[PDB]
Amino acid sequence: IIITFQEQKNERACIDFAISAPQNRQSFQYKTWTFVVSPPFEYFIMAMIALNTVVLMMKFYDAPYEYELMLKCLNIVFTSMFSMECVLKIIAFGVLNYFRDAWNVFDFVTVLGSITDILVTEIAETNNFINLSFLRLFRAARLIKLLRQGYTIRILLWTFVQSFKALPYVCLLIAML
Ligand SMILES: CC(C)CCC[C@@H](C)[C@H]1CC[C@H]2[C@@H]3CC=C4C[C@@H](OC(=O)CCC(=O)O)CC[C@]4(C)[C@H]3CC[C@]12C
Protein backbone atom coordinates (compact mmCIF):
# COMPACT_ATOMS: atom_id res chain seq x y z
CA ILE A 1 0.00 0.00 0.00
CA ILE A 2 2.94 2.34 0.68
CA ILE A 3 4.83 1.35 -2.48
CA THR A 4 1.82 1.84 -4.78
CA PHE A 5 -0.18 4.83 -3.53
CA GLN A 6 -1.53 7.26 -6.10
CA GLU A 7 -0.80 10.97 -5.78
CA GLN A 8 -4.51 11.82 -5.63
CA LYS A 9 8.92 19.46 -9.42
CA ASN A 10 6.44 19.43 -6.54
CA GLU A 11 9.12 20.77 -4.19
CA ARG A 12 9.79 23.66 -6.57
CA ALA A 13 6.06 24.31 -6.94
CA CYS A 14 5.54 24.41 -3.16
CA ILE A 15 8.56 26.69 -2.73
CA ASP A 16 7.36 29.09 -5.44
CA PHE A 17 3.87 29.12 -3.94
CA ALA A 18 5.09 29.77 -0.38
CA ILE A 19 7.29 32.53 -1.81
CA SER A 20 4.11 34.63 -1.72
CA ALA A 21 4.26 34.26 2.09
CA PRO A 22 7.61 44.57 17.42
CA GLN A 23 6.62 47.53 19.61
CA ASN A 24 7.78 51.14 19.75
CA ARG A 25 9.63 53.11 22.46
CA GLN A 26 7.43 55.76 24.09
CA SER A 27 7.03 55.36 27.87
CA PHE A 28 6.87 52.76 30.66
CA GLN A 29 5.37 50.60 27.90
CA TYR A 30 8.90 50.36 26.52
CA LYS A 31 10.36 49.51 29.94
CA THR A 32 7.88 46.65 30.38
CA TRP A 33 8.55 45.53 26.81
CA THR A 34 12.30 45.50 27.50
CA PHE A 35 11.72 43.43 30.64
CA VAL A 36 9.41 40.87 29.02
CA VAL A 37 11.60 40.51 25.90
CA SER A 38 14.74 40.07 28.01
CA PRO A 39 15.98 36.48 27.45
CA PRO A 40 16.35 36.05 31.23
CA PHE A 41 12.58 36.57 31.57
CA GLU A 42 11.70 33.91 28.99
CA TYR A 43 14.25 31.49 30.46
CA PHE A 44 12.79 32.11 33.93
CA ILE A 45 9.32 31.33 32.58
CA MET A 46 10.67 28.09 31.09
CA ALA A 47 12.29 27.18 34.41
CA MET A 48 9.07 27.78 36.34
CA ILE A 49 7.19 25.70 33.76
CA ALA A 50 9.62 22.90 34.60
CA LEU A 51 9.18 23.43 38.35
CA ASN A 52 5.39 23.48 37.99
CA THR A 53 5.51 20.16 36.15
CA VAL A 54 7.72 18.82 38.96
CA VAL A 55 5.13 19.93 41.52
CA LEU A 56 2.37 18.30 39.46
CA MET A 57 4.41 15.09 39.53
CA MET A 58 5.02 15.27 43.30
CA LYS A 59 1.46 14.21 44.20
CA PHE A 60 1.02 10.79 45.77
CA TYR A 61 -1.48 8.79 47.77
CA ASP A 62 -1.94 9.21 51.53
CA ALA A 63 0.30 12.21 52.08
CA PRO A 64 1.03 13.58 55.59
CA TYR A 65 -1.36 16.50 54.81
CA GLU A 66 1.58 18.78 55.46
CA TYR A 67 2.67 17.56 52.04
CA GLU A 68 -0.68 18.30 50.39
CA LEU A 69 -0.73 21.74 52.01
CA MET A 70 2.73 22.47 50.61
CA LEU A 71 1.61 21.30 47.16
CA LYS A 72 -1.45 23.56 47.30
CA CYS A 73 0.69 26.52 48.37
CA LEU A 74 3.17 25.86 45.56
CA ASN A 75 0.33 25.63 43.05
CA ILE A 76 -1.02 28.96 44.33
CA VAL A 77 2.41 30.55 43.94
CA PHE A 78 2.88 29.20 40.42
CA THR A 79 -0.56 30.25 39.18
CA SER A 80 -0.07 33.69 40.75
CA MET A 81 3.24 34.10 38.94
CA PHE A 82 1.68 32.96 35.67
CA SER A 83 -1.16 35.46 36.05
CA MET A 84 1.47 38.13 36.72
CA GLU A 85 3.37 37.10 33.59
CA CYS A 86 0.17 37.40 31.57
CA VAL A 87 -0.40 40.86 33.06
CA LEU A 88 3.09 42.05 32.14
CA LYS A 89 2.60 40.74 28.61
CA ILE A 90 -0.80 42.44 28.28
CA ILE A 91 0.75 45.73 29.45
CA ALA A 92 4.02 45.59 27.47
CA PHE A 93 2.19 44.63 24.28
CA GLY A 94 -1.15 45.87 23.03
CA VAL A 95 -4.32 44.02 23.95
CA LEU A 96 -4.90 43.32 20.26
CA ASN A 97 -1.18 42.56 19.92
CA TYR A 98 -1.54 40.03 22.76
CA PHE A 99 -4.76 38.21 21.85
CA ARG A 100 -3.53 37.78 18.24
CA ASP A 101 -0.70 35.25 18.76
CA ALA A 102 -2.64 31.95 19.15
CA TRP A 103 -0.27 31.09 22.01
CA ASN A 104 -1.01 34.06 24.26
CA VAL A 105 -4.69 33.13 24.03
CA PHE A 106 -3.81 29.63 25.23
CA ASP A 107 -1.71 30.97 28.10
CA PHE A 108 -4.48 33.36 29.13
CA VAL A 109 -7.08 30.57 29.05
CA THR A 110 -4.92 28.28 31.19
CA VAL A 111 -4.25 31.10 33.67
CA LEU A 112 -7.98 31.80 34.04
CA GLY A 113 -8.64 28.07 34.34
CA SER A 114 -6.07 27.73 37.12
CA ILE A 115 -7.46 30.75 39.00
CA THR A 116 -11.02 29.44 38.68
CA ASP A 117 -9.80 26.04 39.89
CA ILE A 118 -8.20 27.67 42.94
CA LEU A 119 -11.40 29.57 43.71
CA VAL A 120 -13.70 26.57 43.23
CA THR A 121 -11.69 23.97 45.17
CA GLU A 122 -12.22 25.91 48.41
CA ILE A 123 -16.03 25.61 48.24
CA ALA A 124 -16.23 22.87 45.60
CA GLU A 125 -18.45 20.45 47.53
CA THR A 126 -21.33 22.97 47.54
CA ASN A 127 -21.66 22.70 43.75
CA ASN A 128 -22.64 19.00 43.70
CA PHE A 129 -22.14 18.61 39.96
CA ILE A 130 -20.04 16.07 38.08
CA ASN A 131 -18.21 18.89 36.26
CA LEU A 132 -16.61 20.36 39.40
CA SER A 133 -13.18 18.76 38.91
CA PHE A 134 -12.68 19.28 35.17
CA LEU A 135 -11.06 22.65 35.94
CA ARG A 136 -7.94 20.73 37.04
CA LEU A 137 -6.96 20.11 33.40
CA PHE A 138 -5.43 23.58 33.02
CA ARG A 139 -2.54 22.92 35.39
CA ALA A 140 -1.62 19.84 33.35
CA ALA A 141 -2.18 21.65 30.04
CA ARG A 142 0.37 24.27 31.09
CA LEU A 143 2.98 21.58 30.31
CA ILE A 144 2.49 22.12 26.55
CA LYS A 145 4.65 25.26 26.54
CA LEU A 146 7.80 23.11 26.34
CA LEU A 147 6.51 21.54 23.12
CA ARG A 148 7.18 24.97 21.61
CA GLN A 149 10.82 24.76 22.68
CA GLY A 150 11.12 21.25 21.28
CA TYR A 151 11.75 22.31 17.71
CA THR A 152 11.95 19.17 15.57
CA ILE A 153 9.19 17.45 17.52
CA ARG A 154 6.92 20.50 17.17
CA ILE A 155 7.59 20.58 13.42
CA LEU A 156 6.84 16.86 13.17
CA LEU A 157 3.57 17.11 15.10
CA TRP A 158 2.37 20.19 13.24
CA THR A 159 3.14 18.62 9.86
CA PHE A 160 1.36 15.36 10.68
CA VAL A 161 -1.61 17.13 12.27
CA GLN A 162 -2.09 19.47 9.32
CA SER A 163 -1.89 16.31 7.20
CA PHE A 164 -4.72 14.82 9.27
CA LYS A 165 -6.70 18.04 8.77
CA ALA A 166 -6.56 17.63 4.97
CA LEU A 167 -8.16 14.15 5.18
CA PRO A 168 -11.58 14.70 6.78
CA TYR A 169 -13.36 12.06 4.67
CA VAL A 170 -11.22 9.00 5.36
CA CYS A 171 -12.10 9.55 9.01
CA LEU A 172 -15.74 9.85 7.95
CA LEU A 173 -15.45 6.50 6.16
CA ILE A 174 -14.03 4.90 9.31
CA ALA A 175 -16.80 6.51 11.37
CA MET A 176 -19.37 5.17 8.90
CA LEU A 177 -17.88 1.68 9.23
C1 LIG B 1 13.88 14.16 35.25
C2 LIG B 1 13.55 14.22 36.76
C3 LIG B 1 14.82 14.63 37.50
C4 LIG B 1 12.46 15.29 37.00
C5 LIG B 1 11.33 14.81 37.98
C6 LIG B 1 11.85 14.55 39.43
C7 LIG B 1 10.68 14.28 40.50
C8 LIG B 1 9.54 15.29 40.22
C9 LIG B 1 10.13 12.94 40.49
C10 LIG B 1 11.24 11.90 40.18
C11 LIG B 1 10.60 10.43 40.81
C12 LIG B 1 9.36 10.90 41.77
C13 LIG B 1 9.03 10.17 43.08
C14 LIG B 1 8.75 8.61 42.73
C15 LIG B 1 8.36 7.81 43.96
C16 LIG B 1 8.24 8.71 45.39
C17 LIG B 1 7.97 7.98 46.73
C18 LIG B 1 6.49 7.83 47.05
O1 LIG B 1 6.40 7.53 48.45
C19 LIG B 1 5.44 6.57 48.86
O2 LIG B 1 4.71 6.08 48.06
C20 LIG B 1 5.34 6.13 50.34
C21 LIG B 1 3.91 5.65 50.60
C22 LIG B 1 3.93 4.26 51.26
O3 LIG B 1 5.00 3.61 51.30
O4 LIG B 1 2.88 3.76 51.75
C23 LIG B 1 5.78 9.13 46.86
C24 LIG B 1 6.09 9.87 45.55
C25 LIG B 1 7.59 10.03 45.29
C26 LIG B 1 8.19 10.94 46.36
C27 LIG B 1 7.86 10.79 43.83
C28 LIG B 1 8.07 12.28 44.02
C29 LIG B 1 8.44 13.03 42.59
C30 LIG B 1 9.55 12.44 41.95
C31 LIG B 1 10.71 12.57 42.92
Short mmCIF file of all heavy atoms in Angstrom, two decimals, residues 49-102:
data_model
loop_
_atom_site.label_atom_id
_atom_site.label_comp_id
_atom_site.label_asym_id
_atom_site.label_seq_id
_atom_site.Cartn_x
_atom_site.Cartn_y
_atom_site.Cartn_z
N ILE A 49 7.95 26.78 34.39
CA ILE A 49 7.19 25.70 33.76
C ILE A 49 7.71 24.35 34.23
O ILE A 49 6.93 23.47 34.63
CB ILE A 49 7.24 25.80 32.22
CG1 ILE A 49 6.65 27.10 31.69
CG2 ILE A 49 6.50 24.62 31.60
CD1 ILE A 49 5.19 27.27 32.00
N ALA A 50 9.03 24.17 34.19
CA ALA A 50 9.62 22.90 34.60
C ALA A 50 9.32 22.61 36.07
O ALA A 50 8.94 21.49 36.43
CB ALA A 50 11.12 22.92 34.35
N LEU A 51 9.48 23.61 36.93
CA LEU A 51 9.18 23.43 38.35
C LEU A 51 7.71 23.13 38.59
O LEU A 51 7.38 22.33 39.47
CB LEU A 51 9.60 24.66 39.15
CG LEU A 51 11.01 24.67 39.75
CD1 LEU A 51 12.08 24.74 38.68
CD2 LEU A 51 11.16 25.81 40.73
N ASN A 52 6.81 23.75 37.83
CA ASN A 52 5.39 23.48 37.99
C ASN A 52 5.07 22.05 37.58
O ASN A 52 4.26 21.38 38.23
CB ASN A 52 4.57 24.48 37.18
CG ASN A 52 3.09 24.38 37.46
OD1 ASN A 52 2.28 25.13 36.91
ND2 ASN A 52 2.71 23.45 38.32
N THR A 53 5.69 21.56 36.50
CA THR A 53 5.51 20.16 36.15
C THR A 53 6.06 19.24 37.24
O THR A 53 5.46 18.20 37.53
CB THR A 53 6.17 19.84 34.81
OG1 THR A 53 7.59 19.93 34.94
CG2 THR A 53 5.69 20.79 33.73
N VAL A 54 7.19 19.61 37.85
CA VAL A 54 7.72 18.82 38.96
C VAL A 54 6.72 18.76 40.10
O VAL A 54 6.48 17.69 40.68
CB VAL A 54 9.07 19.40 39.42
CG1 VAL A 54 9.42 18.88 40.80
CG2 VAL A 54 10.16 19.03 38.43
N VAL A 55 6.11 19.90 40.44
CA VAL A 55 5.13 19.93 41.52
C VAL A 55 3.90 19.09 41.16
O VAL A 55 3.33 18.41 42.02
CB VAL A 55 4.75 21.38 41.86
CG1 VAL A 55 3.58 21.42 42.81
CG2 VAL A 55 5.94 22.10 42.46
N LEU A 56 3.49 19.14 39.90
CA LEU A 56 2.37 18.30 39.46
C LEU A 56 2.71 16.83 39.59
O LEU A 56 1.84 16.00 39.88
CB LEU A 56 2.00 18.64 38.02
CG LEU A 56 1.22 19.92 37.77
CD1 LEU A 56 0.75 19.96 36.33
CD2 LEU A 56 0.05 20.03 38.72
N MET A 57 3.98 16.47 39.38
CA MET A 57 4.41 15.09 39.53
C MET A 57 4.49 14.66 40.99
O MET A 57 4.34 13.46 41.27
CB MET A 57 5.76 14.90 38.85
CG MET A 57 5.72 15.05 37.34
SD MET A 57 7.34 14.90 36.56
CE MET A 57 7.67 13.16 36.78
N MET A 58 4.72 15.59 41.91
CA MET A 58 5.02 15.27 43.30
C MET A 58 3.83 14.72 44.08
O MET A 58 4.01 14.28 45.22
CB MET A 58 5.55 16.51 44.02
CG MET A 58 7.04 16.71 43.89
SD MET A 58 7.55 18.32 44.48
CE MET A 58 7.17 18.18 46.22
N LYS A 59 2.63 14.74 43.51
CA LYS A 59 1.46 14.21 44.20
C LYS A 59 1.62 12.71 44.42
O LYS A 59 2.20 12.01 43.60
CB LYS A 59 0.20 14.49 43.38
CG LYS A 59 -0.23 15.94 43.40
CD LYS A 59 -1.56 16.11 42.68
CE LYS A 59 -2.67 15.39 43.40
NZ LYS A 59 -4.00 15.60 42.76
N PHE A 60 1.10 12.22 45.55
CA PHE A 60 1.02 10.79 45.77
C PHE A 60 -0.07 10.50 46.79
O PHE A 60 -0.65 11.42 47.37
CB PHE A 60 2.37 10.19 46.20
CG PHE A 60 2.78 10.53 47.60
CD1 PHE A 60 2.42 9.73 48.67
CD2 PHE A 60 3.59 11.63 47.86
CE1 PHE A 60 2.81 10.03 49.95
CE2 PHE A 60 3.98 11.93 49.14
CZ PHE A 60 3.59 11.13 50.18
N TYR A 61 -0.33 9.21 46.99
CA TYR A 61 -1.48 8.79 47.77
C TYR A 61 -1.15 8.73 49.25
O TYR A 61 -0.07 8.28 49.65
CB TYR A 61 -1.95 7.42 47.28
CG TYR A 61 -3.10 6.83 48.07
CD1 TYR A 61 -4.27 7.53 48.26
CD2 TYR A 61 -3.00 5.55 48.60
CE1 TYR A 61 -5.32 6.98 48.97
CE2 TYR A 61 -4.04 5.00 49.31
CZ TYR A 61 -5.20 5.72 49.49
OH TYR A 61 -6.23 5.16 50.20
N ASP A 62 -2.09 9.20 50.08
CA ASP A 62 -1.94 9.21 51.53
C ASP A 62 -0.73 10.02 51.97
O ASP A 62 0.23 9.50 52.54
CB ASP A 62 -1.88 7.79 52.09
CG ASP A 62 -3.22 7.31 52.61
OD1 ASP A 62 -4.15 8.13 52.70
OD2 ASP A 62 -3.34 6.11 52.93
N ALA A 63 -0.77 11.32 51.68
CA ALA A 63 0.30 12.21 52.08
C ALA A 63 0.08 12.69 53.52
O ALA A 63 -1.04 12.64 54.04
CB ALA A 63 0.39 13.39 51.13
N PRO A 64 1.15 13.15 54.19
CA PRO A 64 1.03 13.58 55.59
C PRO A 64 0.06 14.73 55.85
O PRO A 64 -0.19 15.07 57.01
CB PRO A 64 2.46 14.02 55.95
CG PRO A 64 3.34 13.52 54.86
CD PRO A 64 2.54 12.83 53.82
N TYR A 65 -0.46 15.35 54.78
CA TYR A 65 -1.36 16.50 54.81
C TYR A 65 -0.61 17.79 55.15
O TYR A 65 -1.14 18.89 54.97
CB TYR A 65 -2.53 16.27 55.79
CG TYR A 65 -3.14 17.53 56.35
CD1 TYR A 65 -4.11 18.23 55.64
CD2 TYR A 65 -2.74 18.04 57.58
CE1 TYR A 65 -4.67 19.39 56.15
CE2 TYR A 65 -3.30 19.20 58.09
CZ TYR A 65 -4.26 19.86 57.37
OH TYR A 65 -4.82 21.02 57.88
N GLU A 66 0.64 17.67 55.57
CA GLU A 66 1.58 18.78 55.46
C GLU A 66 2.32 18.74 54.14
O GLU A 66 3.01 19.70 53.79
CB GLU A 66 2.58 18.77 56.62
CG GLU A 66 2.01 19.29 57.93
CD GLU A 66 1.23 18.24 58.69
OE1 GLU A 66 1.21 17.07 58.24
OE2 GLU A 66 0.63 18.58 59.73
N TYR A 67 2.17 17.64 53.40
CA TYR A 67 2.67 17.56 52.04
C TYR A 67 1.65 18.12 51.06
O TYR A 67 2.01 18.89 50.16
CB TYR A 67 2.99 16.10 51.72
CG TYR A 67 3.71 15.88 50.42
CD1 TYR A 67 5.03 16.26 50.27
CD2 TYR A 67 3.06 15.29 49.34
CE1 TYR A 67 5.69 16.05 49.08
CE2 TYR A 67 3.72 15.08 48.16
CZ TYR A 67 5.03 15.46 48.03
OH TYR A 67 5.69 15.25 46.85
N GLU A 68 0.38 17.76 51.23
CA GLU A 68 -0.68 18.30 50.39
C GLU A 68 -0.80 19.81 50.55
O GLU A 68 -1.03 20.53 49.58
CB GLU A 68 -2.01 17.63 50.72
CG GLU A 68 -1.89 16.16 51.05
CD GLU A 68 -3.23 15.51 51.30
OE1 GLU A 68 -4.23 15.95 50.69
OE2 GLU A 68 -3.29 14.56 52.11
N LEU A 69 -0.66 20.30 51.78
CA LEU A 69 -0.73 21.74 52.01
C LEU A 69 0.41 22.46 51.30
O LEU A 69 0.20 23.52 50.69
CB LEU A 69 -0.69 22.03 53.51
CG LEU A 69 -0.81 23.50 53.93
CD1 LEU A 69 -2.15 24.06 53.50
CD2 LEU A 69 -0.62 23.64 55.43
N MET A 70 1.61 21.89 51.34
CA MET A 70 2.73 22.47 50.61
C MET A 70 2.49 22.45 49.11
O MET A 70 2.82 23.42 48.41
CB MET A 70 4.02 21.73 50.95
CG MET A 70 5.19 22.06 50.04
SD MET A 70 6.40 20.73 49.91
CE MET A 70 7.05 20.69 51.58
N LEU A 71 1.91 21.36 48.59
CA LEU A 71 1.61 21.30 47.16
C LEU A 71 0.59 22.35 46.76
O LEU A 71 0.72 23.00 45.72
CB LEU A 71 1.11 19.90 46.79
CG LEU A 71 2.12 18.76 46.90
CD1 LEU A 71 1.59 17.53 46.20
CD2 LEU A 71 3.45 19.18 46.32
N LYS A 72 -0.44 22.54 47.59
CA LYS A 72 -1.45 23.56 47.30
C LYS A 72 -0.84 24.96 47.33
O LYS A 72 -1.14 25.80 46.48
CB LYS A 72 -2.60 23.45 48.29
CG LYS A 72 -3.75 24.41 48.03
CD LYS A 72 -5.06 23.86 48.56
CE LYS A 72 -5.44 24.52 49.88
NZ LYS A 72 -6.89 24.36 50.18
N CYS A 73 0.03 25.22 48.31
CA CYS A 73 0.69 26.52 48.37
C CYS A 73 1.58 26.75 47.16
O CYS A 73 1.59 27.85 46.59
CB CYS A 73 1.51 26.63 49.66
SG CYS A 73 0.52 26.75 51.16
N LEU A 74 2.33 25.73 46.74
CA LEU A 74 3.17 25.86 45.56
C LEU A 74 2.34 26.10 44.31
O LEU A 74 2.72 26.90 43.44
CB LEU A 74 4.05 24.62 45.40
CG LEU A 74 5.24 24.54 46.35
CD1 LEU A 74 5.92 23.19 46.24
CD2 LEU A 74 6.22 25.66 46.07
N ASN A 75 1.21 25.41 44.19
CA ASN A 75 0.33 25.63 43.05
C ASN A 75 -0.21 27.06 43.05
O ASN A 75 -0.30 27.70 41.99
CB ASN A 75 -0.82 24.63 43.06
CG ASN A 75 -1.82 24.87 41.95
OD1 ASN A 75 -3.00 25.12 42.20
ND2 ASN A 75 -1.35 24.82 40.71
N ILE A 76 -0.56 27.58 44.23
CA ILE A 76 -1.02 28.96 44.33
C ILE A 76 0.07 29.91 43.87
O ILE A 76 -0.18 30.85 43.10
CB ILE A 76 -1.48 29.28 45.76
CG1 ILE A 76 -2.88 28.73 46.01
CG2 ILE A 76 -1.46 30.77 46.01
CD1 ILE A 76 -3.16 28.43 47.47
N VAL A 77 1.30 29.68 44.32
CA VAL A 77 2.41 30.55 43.94
C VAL A 77 2.63 30.52 42.43
O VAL A 77 2.81 31.56 41.79
CB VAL A 77 3.69 30.16 44.70
CG1 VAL A 77 4.86 30.99 44.22
CG2 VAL A 77 3.50 30.37 46.19
N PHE A 78 2.61 29.32 41.85
CA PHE A 78 2.88 29.20 40.42
C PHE A 78 1.78 29.85 39.59
O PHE A 78 2.07 30.57 38.62
CB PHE A 78 3.04 27.73 40.04
CG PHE A 78 4.39 27.16 40.37
CD1 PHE A 78 4.50 26.00 41.11
CD2 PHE A 78 5.54 27.81 39.97
CE1 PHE A 78 5.74 25.48 41.42
CE2 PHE A 78 6.78 27.30 40.28
CZ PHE A 78 6.88 26.14 41.01
N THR A 79 0.51 29.64 39.95
CA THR A 79 -0.56 30.25 39.18
C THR A 79 -0.57 31.77 39.36
O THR A 79 -0.89 32.51 38.43
CB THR A 79 -1.92 29.64 39.54
OG1 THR A 79 -2.93 30.20 38.70
CG2 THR A 79 -2.28 29.93 40.98
N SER A 80 -0.20 32.25 40.55
CA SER A 80 -0.07 33.69 40.75
C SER A 80 1.01 34.27 39.87
O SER A 80 0.82 35.31 39.23
CB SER A 80 0.22 33.99 42.22
OG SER A 80 1.54 33.60 42.56
N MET A 81 2.17 33.60 39.79
CA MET A 81 3.24 34.10 38.94
C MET A 81 2.82 34.08 37.48
O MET A 81 3.18 34.99 36.72
CB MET A 81 4.51 33.26 39.10
CG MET A 81 5.72 33.92 38.43
SD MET A 81 5.89 33.60 36.66
CE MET A 81 6.52 31.94 36.64
N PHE A 82 2.10 33.05 37.06
CA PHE A 82 1.68 32.96 35.67
C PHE A 82 0.67 34.05 35.33
O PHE A 82 0.73 34.64 34.24
CB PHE A 82 1.11 31.57 35.38
CG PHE A 82 2.16 30.53 35.18
CD1 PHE A 82 2.04 29.28 35.76
CD2 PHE A 82 3.30 30.81 34.44
CE1 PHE A 82 3.01 28.33 35.59
CE2 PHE A 82 4.27 29.85 34.27
CZ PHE A 82 4.12 28.61 34.85
N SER A 83 -0.25 34.34 36.25
CA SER A 83 -1.16 35.46 36.05
C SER A 83 -0.38 36.77 35.95
O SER A 83 -0.69 37.62 35.11
CB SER A 83 -2.17 35.52 37.19
OG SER A 83 -1.68 36.30 38.27
N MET A 84 0.64 36.94 36.80
CA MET A 84 1.47 38.13 36.72
C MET A 84 2.19 38.23 35.38
O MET A 84 2.27 39.32 34.81
CB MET A 84 2.50 38.13 37.86
CG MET A 84 3.09 39.49 38.20
SD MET A 84 1.90 40.82 38.49
CE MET A 84 0.68 40.01 39.53
N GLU A 85 2.71 37.11 34.89
CA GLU A 85 3.37 37.10 33.59
C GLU A 85 2.41 37.50 32.48
O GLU A 85 2.77 38.26 31.57
CB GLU A 85 3.96 35.71 33.34
CG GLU A 85 4.85 35.60 32.12
CD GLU A 85 4.06 35.34 30.86
OE1 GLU A 85 2.98 34.72 30.95
OE2 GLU A 85 4.53 35.74 29.78
N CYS A 86 1.18 36.99 32.54
CA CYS A 86 0.17 37.40 31.57
C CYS A 86 -0.11 38.90 31.67
O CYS A 86 -0.31 39.57 30.65
CB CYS A 86 -1.11 36.60 31.77
SG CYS A 86 -2.43 36.98 30.59
N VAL A 87 -0.14 39.43 32.89
CA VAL A 87 -0.40 40.86 33.06
C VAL A 87 0.74 41.69 32.46
O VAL A 87 0.50 42.68 31.76
CB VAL A 87 -0.61 41.20 34.55
CG1 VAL A 87 -0.76 42.70 34.73
CG2 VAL A 87 -1.85 40.50 35.07
N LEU A 88 1.98 41.31 32.73
CA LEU A 88 3.09 42.05 32.14
C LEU A 88 3.10 41.95 30.62
O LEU A 88 3.44 42.92 29.94
CB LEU A 88 4.44 41.62 32.74
CG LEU A 88 4.80 42.18 34.12
CD1 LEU A 88 4.02 41.64 35.30
CD2 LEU A 88 6.29 42.00 34.37
N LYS A 89 2.73 40.79 30.06
CA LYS A 89 2.60 40.74 28.61
C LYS A 89 1.49 41.66 28.11
O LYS A 89 1.68 42.40 27.14
CB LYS A 89 2.36 39.31 28.12
CG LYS A 89 3.63 38.51 27.90
CD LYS A 89 3.34 37.19 27.21
CE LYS A 89 4.63 36.52 26.74
NZ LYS A 89 5.53 36.12 27.85
N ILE A 90 0.32 41.64 28.77
CA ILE A 90 -0.80 42.44 28.28
C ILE A 90 -0.54 43.93 28.45
O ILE A 90 -1.15 44.75 27.75
CB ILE A 90 -2.11 42.02 28.97
CG1 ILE A 90 -3.32 42.61 28.26
CG2 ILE A 90 -2.16 42.50 30.40
CD1 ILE A 90 -3.51 42.08 26.88
N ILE A 91 0.37 44.32 29.35
CA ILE A 91 0.75 45.73 29.45
C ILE A 91 1.85 46.08 28.45
O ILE A 91 1.76 47.10 27.76
CB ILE A 91 1.16 46.08 30.89
CG1 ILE A 91 0.09 45.64 31.88
CG2 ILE A 91 1.42 47.57 31.01
CD1 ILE A 91 -1.13 46.55 31.92
N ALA A 92 2.91 45.27 28.36
CA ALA A 92 4.02 45.59 27.47
C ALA A 92 3.58 45.60 26.01
O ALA A 92 3.99 46.47 25.23
CB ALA A 92 5.16 44.59 27.68
N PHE A 93 2.75 44.64 25.62
CA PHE A 93 2.19 44.63 24.28
C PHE A 93 0.77 45.19 24.31
O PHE A 93 0.18 45.38 25.37
CB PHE A 93 2.18 43.22 23.70
CG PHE A 93 3.52 42.55 23.69
CD1 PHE A 93 3.75 41.41 24.44
CD2 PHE A 93 4.56 43.07 22.93
CE1 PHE A 93 4.99 40.80 24.43
CE2 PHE A 93 5.80 42.46 22.92
CZ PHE A 93 6.01 41.33 23.67
N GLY A 94 0.24 45.46 23.12
CA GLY A 94 -1.15 45.87 23.03
C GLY A 94 -2.08 44.72 23.32
O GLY A 94 -1.72 43.55 23.20
N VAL A 95 -3.31 45.05 23.71
CA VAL A 95 -4.32 44.02 23.95
C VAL A 95 -4.60 43.25 22.66
O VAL A 95 -4.65 42.02 22.65
CB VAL A 95 -5.60 44.64 24.53
CG1 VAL A 95 -6.61 43.55 24.85
CG2 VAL A 95 -5.27 45.44 25.77
N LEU A 96 -4.77 43.98 21.56
CA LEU A 96 -4.90 43.32 20.26
C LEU A 96 -3.61 42.60 19.90
O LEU A 96 -3.65 41.47 19.38
CB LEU A 96 -5.27 44.34 19.18
CG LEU A 96 -6.76 44.69 19.01
CD1 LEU A 96 -7.55 43.45 18.60
CD2 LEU A 96 -7.36 45.32 20.26
N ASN A 97 -2.46 43.22 20.17
CA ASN A 97 -1.18 42.56 19.92
C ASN A 97 -1.00 41.30 20.75
O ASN A 97 -0.27 40.40 20.32
CB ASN A 97 -0.03 43.53 20.19
CG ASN A 97 0.22 44.48 19.04
OD1 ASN A 97 0.25 44.07 17.88
ND2 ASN A 97 0.40 45.76 19.36
N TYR A 98 -1.64 41.21 21.91
CA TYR A 98 -1.54 40.03 22.76
C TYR A 98 -2.49 38.93 22.31
O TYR A 98 -2.06 37.80 22.06
CB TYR A 98 -1.82 40.41 24.22
CG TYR A 98 -1.68 39.27 25.20
CD1 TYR A 98 -0.43 38.81 25.59
CD2 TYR A 98 -2.80 38.65 25.74
CE1 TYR A 98 -0.30 37.77 26.49
CE2 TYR A 98 -2.68 37.61 26.64
CZ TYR A 98 -1.42 37.18 27.01
OH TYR A 98 -1.30 36.14 27.90
N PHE A 99 -3.78 39.24 22.19
CA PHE A 99 -4.76 38.21 21.85
C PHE A 99 -4.71 37.78 20.38
O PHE A 99 -5.61 37.07 19.94
CB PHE A 99 -6.18 38.66 22.19
CG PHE A 99 -6.44 38.81 23.66
CD1 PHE A 99 -5.78 39.78 24.41
CD2 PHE A 99 -7.34 37.98 24.30
CE1 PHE A 99 -6.03 39.91 25.76
CE2 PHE A 99 -7.58 38.11 25.65
CZ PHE A 99 -6.93 39.07 26.38
N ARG A 100 -3.68 38.19 19.63
CA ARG A 100 -3.53 37.78 18.24
C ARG A 100 -2.23 37.01 18.00
O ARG A 100 -1.54 37.25 17.01
CB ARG A 100 -3.60 39.00 17.32
CG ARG A 100 -4.97 39.65 17.26
CD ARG A 100 -5.00 40.81 16.28
NE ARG A 100 -4.20 41.93 16.77
CZ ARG A 100 -3.08 42.36 16.20
NH1 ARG A 100 -2.61 41.75 15.12
NH2 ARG A 100 -2.42 43.39 16.72
N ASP A 101 -1.90 36.07 18.89
CA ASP A 101 -0.70 35.25 18.76
C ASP A 101 -0.99 33.76 18.74
O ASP A 101 -0.10 32.99 18.36
CB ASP A 101 0.28 35.56 19.90
CG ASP A 101 1.70 35.12 19.59
OD1 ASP A 101 1.98 34.77 18.43
OD2 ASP A 101 2.53 35.13 20.52
N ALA A 102 -2.18 33.34 19.17
CA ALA A 102 -2.64 31.95 19.15
C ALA A 102 -1.91 31.10 20.19
O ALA A 102 -2.29 29.95 20.43
CB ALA A 102 -2.48 31.33 17.76
#
